[PDB]
Amino acid sequence: EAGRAALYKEVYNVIASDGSYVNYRHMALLVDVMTTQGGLTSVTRHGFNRSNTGALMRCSFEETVEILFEAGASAELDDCRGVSENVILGQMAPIGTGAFDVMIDEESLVKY
Amino acid sequence: LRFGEMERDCMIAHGAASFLKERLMEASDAFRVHICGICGLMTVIAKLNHNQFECKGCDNKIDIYQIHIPYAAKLLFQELMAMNITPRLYTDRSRDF
Amino acid sequence: MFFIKDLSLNITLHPSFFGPRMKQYLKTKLLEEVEGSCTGKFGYILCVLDYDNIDIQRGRILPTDGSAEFNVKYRAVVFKPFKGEVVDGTVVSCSQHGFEVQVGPMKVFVTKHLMPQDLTFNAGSNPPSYQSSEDVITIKSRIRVKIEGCISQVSSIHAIGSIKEDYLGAI
Amino acid sequence: VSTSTFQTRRRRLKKVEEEENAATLQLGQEFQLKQINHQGEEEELIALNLSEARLVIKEALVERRRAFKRSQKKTREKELESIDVLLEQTTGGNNKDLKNTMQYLTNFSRFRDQETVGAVIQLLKSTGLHPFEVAQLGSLACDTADEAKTLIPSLNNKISDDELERILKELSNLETLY
Amino acid sequence: IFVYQNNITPSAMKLVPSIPPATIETFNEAALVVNITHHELVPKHIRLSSDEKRELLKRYRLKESQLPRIQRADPVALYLGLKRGEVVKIIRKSETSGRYASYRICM
Amino acid sequence: RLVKALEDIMVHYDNTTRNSLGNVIQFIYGEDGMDAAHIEKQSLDTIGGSDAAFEKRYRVDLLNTDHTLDPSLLESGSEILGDLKLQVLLDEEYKQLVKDRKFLREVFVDGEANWPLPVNIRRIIQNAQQTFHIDHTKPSDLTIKDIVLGVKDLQENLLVLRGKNEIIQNAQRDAVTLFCCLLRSRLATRRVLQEYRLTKQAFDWVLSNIEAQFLRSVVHPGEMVGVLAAQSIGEPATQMTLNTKKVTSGVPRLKEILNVAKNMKTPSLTV
Amino acid sequence: GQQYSSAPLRTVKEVQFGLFSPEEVRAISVAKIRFPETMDETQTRAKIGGLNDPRLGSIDRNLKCQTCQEGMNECPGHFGHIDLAKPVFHVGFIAKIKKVCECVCMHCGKLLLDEHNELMRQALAIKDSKKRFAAIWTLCKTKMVCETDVPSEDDPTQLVSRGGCGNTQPTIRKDGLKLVGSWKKDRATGDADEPELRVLSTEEILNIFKHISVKDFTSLGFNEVFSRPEWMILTCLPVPPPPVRPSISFNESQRGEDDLTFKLADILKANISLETLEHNGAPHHAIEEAESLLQFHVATYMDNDIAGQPQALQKSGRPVKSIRARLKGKEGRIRGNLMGKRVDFSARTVISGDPNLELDQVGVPKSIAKTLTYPEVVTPYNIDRLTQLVRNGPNEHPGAKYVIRDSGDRIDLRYSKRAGDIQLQYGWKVERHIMDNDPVLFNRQPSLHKMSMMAHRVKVIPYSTFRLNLSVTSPYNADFDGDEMNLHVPQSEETRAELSQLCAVPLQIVSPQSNKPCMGIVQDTLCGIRKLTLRDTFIELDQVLNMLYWVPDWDGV
Amino acid sequence: KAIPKDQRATTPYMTKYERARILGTRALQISMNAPVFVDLEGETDPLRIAMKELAEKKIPLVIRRYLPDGSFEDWSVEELIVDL
DNA sequence: CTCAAGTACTTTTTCCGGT
RNA sequence: CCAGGA
DNA sequence: AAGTACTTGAG
Numbered sequence A: 001e002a003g004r005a006a007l008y009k010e011v012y013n014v015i016a017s018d019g020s021y022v023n024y025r026h027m028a029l030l031v032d033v034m035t036t037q038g039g040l041t042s043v044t045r046h047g048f049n050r051s052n053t054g055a056l057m058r059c060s061f062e063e064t065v066e067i068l069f070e071a072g073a074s075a076e077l078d079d080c081r082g083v084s085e086n087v088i089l090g091q092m093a094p095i096g097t098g099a100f101d102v103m104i105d106e107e108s109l110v111k112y
Numbered sequence B: 001l002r003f004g005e006m007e008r009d010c011m012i013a014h015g016a017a018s019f020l021k022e023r024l025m026e027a028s029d030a031f032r033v034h035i036c037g038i039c040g041l042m043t044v045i046a047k048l049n050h051n052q053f054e055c056k057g058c059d060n061k062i063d064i065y066q067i068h069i070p071y072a073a074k075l076l077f078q079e080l081m082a083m084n085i086t087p088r089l090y091t092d093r094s095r096d097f
Numbered sequence C: 001m002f003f004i005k006d007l008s009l010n011i012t013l014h015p016s017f018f019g020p021r022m023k024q025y026l027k028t029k030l031l032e033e034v035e036g037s038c039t040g041k042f043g044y045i046l047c048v049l050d051y052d053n054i055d056i057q058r059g060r061i062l063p064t065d066g067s068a069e070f071n072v073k074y075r076a077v078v079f080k081p082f083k084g085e086v087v088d089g090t091v092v093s094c095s096q097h098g099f100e101v102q103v104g105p106m107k108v109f110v111t112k113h114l115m116p117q118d119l120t121f122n123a124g125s126n127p128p129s130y131q132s133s134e135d136v137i138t139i140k141s142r143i144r145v146k147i148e149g150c151i152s153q154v155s156s157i158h159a160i161g162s163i164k165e166d167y168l169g170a171i
Numbered sequence D: 001v002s003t004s005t006f007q008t009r010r011r012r013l014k015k016v017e018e019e020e021n022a023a024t025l026q027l028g029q030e031f032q033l034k035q036i037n038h039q040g041e042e043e044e045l046i047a048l049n050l051s052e053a054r055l056v057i058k059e060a061l062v063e064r065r066r067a068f069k070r071s072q073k074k075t076r077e078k079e080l081e082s083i084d085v086l087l088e089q090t091t092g093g094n095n096k097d098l099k100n101t102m103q104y105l106t107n108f109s110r111f112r113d114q115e116t117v118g119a120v121i122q123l124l125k126s127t128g129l130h131p132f133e134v135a136q137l138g139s140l141a142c143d144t145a146d147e148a149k150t151l152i153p154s155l156n157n158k159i160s161d162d163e164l165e166r167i168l169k170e171l172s173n174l175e176t177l178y
Numbered sequence E: 001i002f003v004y005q006n007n008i009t010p011s012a013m014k015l016v017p018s019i020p021p022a023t024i025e026t027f028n029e030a031a032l033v034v035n036i037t038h039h040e041l042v043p044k045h046i047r048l049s050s051d052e053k054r055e056l057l058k059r060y061r062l063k064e065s066q067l068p069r070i071q072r073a074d075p076v077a078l079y080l081g082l083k084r085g086e087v088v089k090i091i092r093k094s095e096t097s098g099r100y101a102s103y104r105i106c107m
Numbered sequence F: 001r002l003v004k005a006l007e008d009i010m011v012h013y014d015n016t017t018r019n020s021l022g023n024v025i026q027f028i029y030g031e032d033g034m035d036a037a038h039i040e041k042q043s044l045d046t047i048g049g050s051d052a053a054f055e056k057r058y059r060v061d062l063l064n065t066d067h068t069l070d071p072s073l074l075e076s077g078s079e080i081l082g083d084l085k086l087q088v089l090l091d092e093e094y095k096q097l098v099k100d101r102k103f104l105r106e107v108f109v110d111g112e113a114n115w116p117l118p119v120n121i122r123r124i125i126q127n128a129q130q131t132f133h134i135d136h137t138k139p140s141d142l143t144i145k146d147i148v149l150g151v152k153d154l155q156e157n158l159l160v161l162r163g164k165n166e167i168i169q170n171a172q173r174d175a176v177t178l179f180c181c182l183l184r185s186r187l188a189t190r191r192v193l194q195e196y197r198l199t200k201q202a203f204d205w206v207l208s209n210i211e212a213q214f215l216r217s218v219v220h221p222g223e224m225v226g227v228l229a230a231q232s233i234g235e236p237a238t239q240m241t242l243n244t245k246k247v248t249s250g251v252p253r254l255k256e257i258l259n260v261a262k263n264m265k266t267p268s269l270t271v
Numbered sequence G: 001g002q003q004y005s006s007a008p009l010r011t012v013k014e015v016q017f018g019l020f021s022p023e024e025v026r027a028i029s030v031a032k033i034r035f036p037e038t039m040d041e042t043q044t045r046a047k048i049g050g051l052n053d054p055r056l057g058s059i060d061r062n063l064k065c066q067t068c069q070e071g072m073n074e075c076p077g078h079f080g081h082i083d084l085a086k087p088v089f090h091v092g093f094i095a096k097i098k099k100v101c102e103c104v105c106m107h108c109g110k111l112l113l114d115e116h117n118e119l120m121r122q123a124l125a126i127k128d129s130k131k132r133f134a135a136i137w138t139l140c141k142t143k144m145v146c147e148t149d150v151p152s153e154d155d156p157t158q159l160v161s162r163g164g165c166g167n168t169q170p171t172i173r174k175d176g177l178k179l180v181g182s183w184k185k186d187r188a189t190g191d192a193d194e195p196e197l198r199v200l201s202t203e204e205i206l207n208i209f210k211h212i213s214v215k216d217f218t219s220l221g222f223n224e225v226f227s228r229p230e231w232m233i234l235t236c237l238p239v240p241p242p243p244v245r246p247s248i249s250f251n252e253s254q255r256g257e258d259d260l261t262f263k264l265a266d267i268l269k270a271n272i273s274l275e276t277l278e279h280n281g282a283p284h285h286a287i288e289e290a291e292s293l294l295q296f297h298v299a300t301y302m303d304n305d306i307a308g309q310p311q312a313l314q315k316s317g318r319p320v321k322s323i324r325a326r327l328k329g330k331e332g333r334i335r336g337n338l339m340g341k342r343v344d345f346s347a348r349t350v351i352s353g354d355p356n357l358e359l360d361q362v363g364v365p366k367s368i369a370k371t372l373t374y375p376e377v378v379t380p381y382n383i384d385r386l387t388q389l390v391r392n393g394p395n396e397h398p399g400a401k402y403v404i405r406d407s408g409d410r411i412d413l414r415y416s417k418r419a420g421d422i423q424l425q426y427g428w429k430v431e432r433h434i435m436d437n438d439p440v441l442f443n444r445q446p447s448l449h450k451m452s453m454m455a456h457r458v459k460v461i462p463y464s465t466f467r468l469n470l471s472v473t474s475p476y477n478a479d480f481d482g483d484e485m486n487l488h489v490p491q492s493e494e495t496r497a498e499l500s501q502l503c504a505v506p507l508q509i510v511s512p513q514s515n516k517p518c519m520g521i522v523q524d525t526l527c528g529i530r531k532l533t534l535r536d537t538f539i540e541l542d543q544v545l546n547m548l549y550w551v552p553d554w555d556g557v
Numbered sequence H: 001k002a003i004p005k006d007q008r009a010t011t012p013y014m015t016k017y018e019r020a021r022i023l024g025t026r027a028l029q030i031s032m033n034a035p036v037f038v039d040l041e042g043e044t045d046p047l048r049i050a051m052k053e054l055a056e057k058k059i060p061l062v063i064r065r066y067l068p069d070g071s072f073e074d075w076s077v078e079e080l081i082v083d084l
Numbered sequence I: 001c002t003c004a005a006g007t008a009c010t011t012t013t014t015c016c017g018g019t
Numbered sequence J: 001c002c003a004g005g006a
Numbered sequence K: 001a002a003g004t005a006c007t008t009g010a011g
Ligand SMILES: Nc1ncnc2c1ncn2[C@@H]1O[C@H](COP(=O)(O)CP(=O)(O)OP(=O)(O)O)[C@@H](O)[C@H]1O
Pocket: F242, F243, F244, G445, G446, G477, G481, I013, I014, J006
């Protein structure tokens, strides 16, 4: 918890060194993201890219072919929840506009 | 023009879901394969016009679907296959969560 | 046999039909596709039961095209034959090879050899007949056949049937 | 697109085994005893004896003619003409299969009346025999317990020889005249 | 709890899991000289009951996985004698909300 | 790297901030559940000043011939004197304001009153004054109950989380905490009547607008906050290059930080 | 365009990774793939019934595919196969193959540690497929003996017999594409003192892997359905179809075969050599020679950039492009063909600022407007307008390029002998020129910002440059020293809405990056604004009247 | 499994994205000669027709808002507040 | 069996004519 | 690959 | 280059 506070303090100071102001929330998110696993998760292929996200998603950054080889070897199942995977699949990602579904109601249709 | 990763990124930031799908599909790559519902690969000998479907070595002349994926993805899957990796594409779930 | 079966069909409606006579267009498109149909999985889908209570559910609008997809849940009468099934039918055709028997929507063909020995072909009759010592089998005669095997053939199902064993043959 | 069921089973890569179907009462995956209706409830297999079947379709199309004429506001040889007319009214007409089925049923039905088919259905569904056997006992006219036990080879030890012969008596009595 | 001066032999340390359902804890006297919980940067952690946890997960529709984790070796996890699976509710002062509550599941 | 780490993160329909595993990153976006565009630097008056000058500004004492609201401030001014029942409300009020001050002083250790918060209250009051043509002479048609309770009610309508249970309602309470300190600070009885000179109607309109403006301010389930954060940290650093104690800083310190560099360049303590 | 298919259209909800069982490869295969020769049926320019279409995909563009009857843009490729004369390691699994041998007995195929060991039961407890394998390995790598009898889960005086086999285990080390062991031995208690040094054959590892129990291998990474360890060893090789390795077919009679088409023949040649060598008078060493060559060719076909240096280099010195290389980031599949693509309905030119444009508009040069096209559906609301644009043709500004029939077959207004007499029917599509007020995605790379890509109102103007309002300069980080910008035209009534409703320039005025406006008055306007507003600065009627008129929304007061 | 109407918790206000997707979807439908549930007061652009339908709350669409667990709350465009 | 130096791997901004 | 552009 | 992960060999 104190690691998170230190980490932010330290990040904020690089941005604020230049003078430039970045809203809390953005730094907080990054800081939180590295933190949540229980320790200091690097923003490298050794950090986030080795977490339990989808094979297609992780293969899109840094270790590629190697990631896909271990996918085949351990019979990995891609959830297909990540932006990246839907981009690779050419599907509407569950991002903003795609975060929900649209339905026609015959009830409302017959009312008008 | 190349609609780069950085460019994708802003569309993701805007939440322009359909817009991104259109750039990556409709207005580029966009292709149609026939996949098998048992061994989730591009195996299907879709003689569309004769309405014959088949996937010999599944003996599946029934459980077949069509999907719209970027041709580069069709390619990626065929490339991984050539390298012994099976990227099985499935049109339903099992895991839930 | 002849079953009532709970089935469901996904139909994709074009926006031009997003009028208030929608459920009606859907109920009919279902019948167009489903009714009369013949699959190996379910056999002959003959008649959709309970038209008044067909479950349309909510239609999901398909992203880049305008259309909406509905899984039309329903219940219908199906005919799915099996081997070992003893069926009563009427003769339809007759040759030196055997005779076809019409069993509901389906045809069961009885081989010259799938019949008892006594019963033999007779080309010299109108229409050609199978003449036994005491029996005669021709185009209008009613027969009781045992289905030996089935073949799922596109928009149909066919079968080879025996009349050689006990209690089978002409009725 | 084609029709789906209520049986969802995840056949993941594992293609086959597909055992033959028989009078070892070994019907399909789809035609097994423990079915599921759209209400999600476990329901039993619905097998019909041609007459139990004739009356279902007859009823269905009759009630379809009601719905059709509402939405449009703003003796055997004689039953055959009556039915072939109702088909032209409610069915696709392209559906030759139903026209054949309806005639076959009209000519091959063992019980003409709903009340008659009622008692058939009562008498039989008290044997514990499986929907198939129960329908086959309804659609096949048998005299010897043997005739029936030979044509429906599943029955084999499932019923008494005398009990089946007792049932065969009542089905012959119920048998509507033509 | 066992407060040791310098060390505990690899011999003695093998007798720690020996007596269940009862539990044992090792603590180097030197680490304890200053209380870490008192630090500016260390927020108010609270161990949740078996019922409280059940509610947390029900109330947010979570699997145990989805919860931000705390290491079992974590100084504060040791301080409270946190056991794997136990959740801590962390109350921090927020420059945005005034007070913000996070939760961490034990590792 | 910042984009690929955060890509999959967004606000869900429960205001929770989850990745593609549905793992909770932030329970509520940026601890407050507000969209950054809607935020503005506002001054939490209550934080600073002499304990003396705080009292002069906020305190109403209907039981003191000197510390009452003059009958020049409101119509009830005369009949309001010595009203024990109302002096109970004004006591709750002032005791809550003092609570607020001590709490804020815990959060903001140096007494920085200027913090970016949603709903610019200064503007709302300003706008009410020109909208209703506030007569800085004439006494208000407000009751102590009109102000005191009106504020207290608006507070219950500042909705970030909607759930009907203790966890969520206690989380809703928490999310709204700091905004309320500001709200109570700007809408205290003395402040409203003496400084703003708001009419009952003007006040009602101020309240409605705070409510509307607040609700508008909350983040939208679907907001792709992951990418947003990456670019918001990223973009500065990229221009901070492309354009025109001595501890490692800038681009290399940032590189040090994200990489979680063990052997760092200038390790320093501050005792 | 692609033709109608009766098959139900779906979305990929899950991707199930795994490995190819040789049996699957043979099952799915439409041909084997016997001759290194591409084609020329004895010089006769047509595909050989042996490599690259012995039923496979298709070439010629004319002439349909031999299996599906589709042809070129419809036919995906069709897979083939090569039965390898001897097993070979898949390059990618070489260390996982090693790490498995390290965990399992090299004789019985049992795990070197089991339920009986305490740290083992603790590690077997690990839920994570990767973390479990990690812990099993570090534990078993050191167990150099398969245990027959082991100390019981009580008193160690009475020893419980687990699985059988006593056998000493090798100390495996990799010698590039070869896995070699070193069994300690025993000889007068001392040994080693010179141990048993021998290479582990692909076939023996295979037979051990084959014997690894489901429960055993399933405790390691593996899944009994999709990926058994025996499938990390290649027996039957899939042959990718032409669409994967197309010939760059220059002139009529001339080849130009792909790098993979060569590498496959290389494999094919190495395989036939080995096959004949063993079937004939096997000179033993000559076999373990032609074997290791086929192991190389099968290795380098998938990954050419291997640690053990010799790059399989083309006769030209230049190295062969491995499949691994094709997918490696920034350029190449994932990063360069999928995460980013080259797009249609894109335009780019030199940008120059305009003080007479509105904040949200973008000056589009007539030539650019006349090229870019939006597909509009023939509806009764626009039927007449569209018929005029169609009359106008692809040369006039408010005009059209193509008309899309029900049939789906495009009518080129540029040539169509019926470009005049062309009667539009509802539900058709007219691809019309981009018009004043259409929403378009305007962008300036970098694109560090969400704001570096905003939606604008089209304004068709003369002169070859994209004109933008000066205040919109800042977000893009644009200037006019020779900067160029990109324009993207949405094609859906749906994507149009996405731009207009979410990413329009006026919506982006206040930035969440800093919780303040990201656009303001700049340069001339800022400089002049100071000058205009000093007390000192007064204006006579004549000018005041022109300044007043200039404000488009002035009340006339 | 679908949250009942009397158990819904999500914003009673329409998200920026929901509005955009609704307007897009209707425009795309209207454009494909779909039936219009409003008086076109001389309107010819389908986005403007959709804006009009949204204003009169005569759009027959439902937003299915999925929660991270998979469960969802169905909301009519008629029932959603439009403060955007 | 714990300890150290050594080797193994992986990457380094975005977009846009001539040999 | 080389030479350039913001 | 430059780092860090991973594996190696000496004490
Ligand atoms: N190599 C590069 N890579 C990426 N972006 C670049 C780039 N070079 C230039 N740019 C883009 O173009 C801008 C550079 O402007 P330049 O033409 O170099 C003059 P400057 O040094 O930025 O300002 P100045 O002329 O007032 O001294 C950058 O701020 C950036 O957004």
